[PDB]
Write a protein that binds this ligand. Structure first.
Ligand code: RQT
Ligand code: PHU
Length: 279
């Protein structure tokens, strides 16, 4: 098995991020001990109950089974249990957009949109719901290439259903979630499409803090209140210089009824042809 990384050869470098039940660390897999080894990102749990340990075992199996240019690559595990992934050096898309705004044009955002869409299309085809999709957990491999990451809330669909219900949703951020998620804790590939709409909003505002989803809710008046806005048909406003056709795609992603939202398969070509027509 080349899929097993020895604890002793994973050299801690620094922390990339920390949740409440887990963290990701930049490490060097340095078996030769000369610091020529490759950088990897390593996820582990802290203060984890047995429930979280099982979830993490599933998460590892899910990520491992996904083979897409647009999904963060599984490399292996270390055995206590640690998930080893490729390191994507440019970090999360949210911060990247803020930092490099000036050198990213509409074309580039469409490229990212298209990559994320393909990624989500691929997920759907493995009957996986991501749920957490947002600019803060999409990663940047390069200026020309993003990938979906953070499968901490990802779940495979029941084999007899196209959605699932979660019993306790925790204290996750509400501004990316579809109404059926907010009202009944329902999640599906069609709720993912809603979330993708919010990601398009993020991309095309370059994740400016003053018009973030959370900022725009506060202006436009917690869980009960947002849900009421959405049922009334209120949506995030068109980003300042957003191409009309992108804004329209967002609004479709945010259809009240899950069955009226476009599929990722239908979004893909529409985004790709806006790219051709912009560049
Ligand atoms: C945008 C802030 C944030 O939460 N970024 C973040 C958190 C945790 C991990 C990463 C990161 C950066 N490069 C990586 N490569 C692979 C896996 C995770 C990872 C970024
Ligand atoms: N999808 C969408 O428009 N949601 C929303 C609406 C108002 C405030 C925050 C988020």
């Amino acid at each position: 098995d080349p899929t097993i990384f020895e604890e002793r050869h994973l050299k801690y470098i620094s922390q990339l991020g920390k949740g409440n039940f887990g963290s990701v660390e930049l490490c060097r897999y340095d078996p030769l001990g000369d610091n020529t080894g490759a950088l990897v990102a390593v996820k582990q749990l802290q203060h984890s109950g047995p429930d979280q340990q099982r979830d993490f075992q599933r998460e590892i199996q899910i990520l491992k089974a996904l083979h897409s240019d647009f999904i963060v690559k599984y490399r292996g595990v270390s055995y206590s249990l640690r998930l080893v992934m490729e390191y994507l050096p440019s970090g999360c898309l949210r911060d990247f957009l803020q930092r490099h705004r000036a050198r990213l044009d509409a074309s580039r955002l469409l490229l990212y949109s298209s990559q994320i869409c393909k990624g989500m299309e691929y997920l759907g085809s493995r009957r996986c719901v991501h749920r957490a999709l947002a600019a803060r957990n999409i990663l940047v491999e390069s200026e020309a290439h993003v990938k979906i990451a953070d499968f901490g809330l990802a779940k495979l669909l029941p084999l007899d259903k196209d959605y699932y219900v979660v019993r306790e949703p925790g204290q996750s951020p509400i501004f990316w979630y579809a109404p059926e998620s907010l009202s009944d804790n329902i999640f599906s590939r069609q709720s993912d499409v809603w979330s993708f709409g919010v990601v398009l909003y993020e991309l095309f505002t370059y994740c400016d803090k003053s018009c973030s989803p959370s900022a725009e809710f506060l202006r436009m008046m917690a869980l009960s209140r947002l849900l009421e806005l959405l049922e009334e048909g209120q949506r995030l406003p068109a980003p300042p210089a957003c191409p009309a056709e992108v804004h329209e795609l967002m609004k479709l992603c945010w259809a009240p009824s899950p069955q009226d939202r476009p599929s990722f398969s239908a979004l893909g070509p529409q985004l790709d042809m806006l790219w051709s027509g912009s560049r």
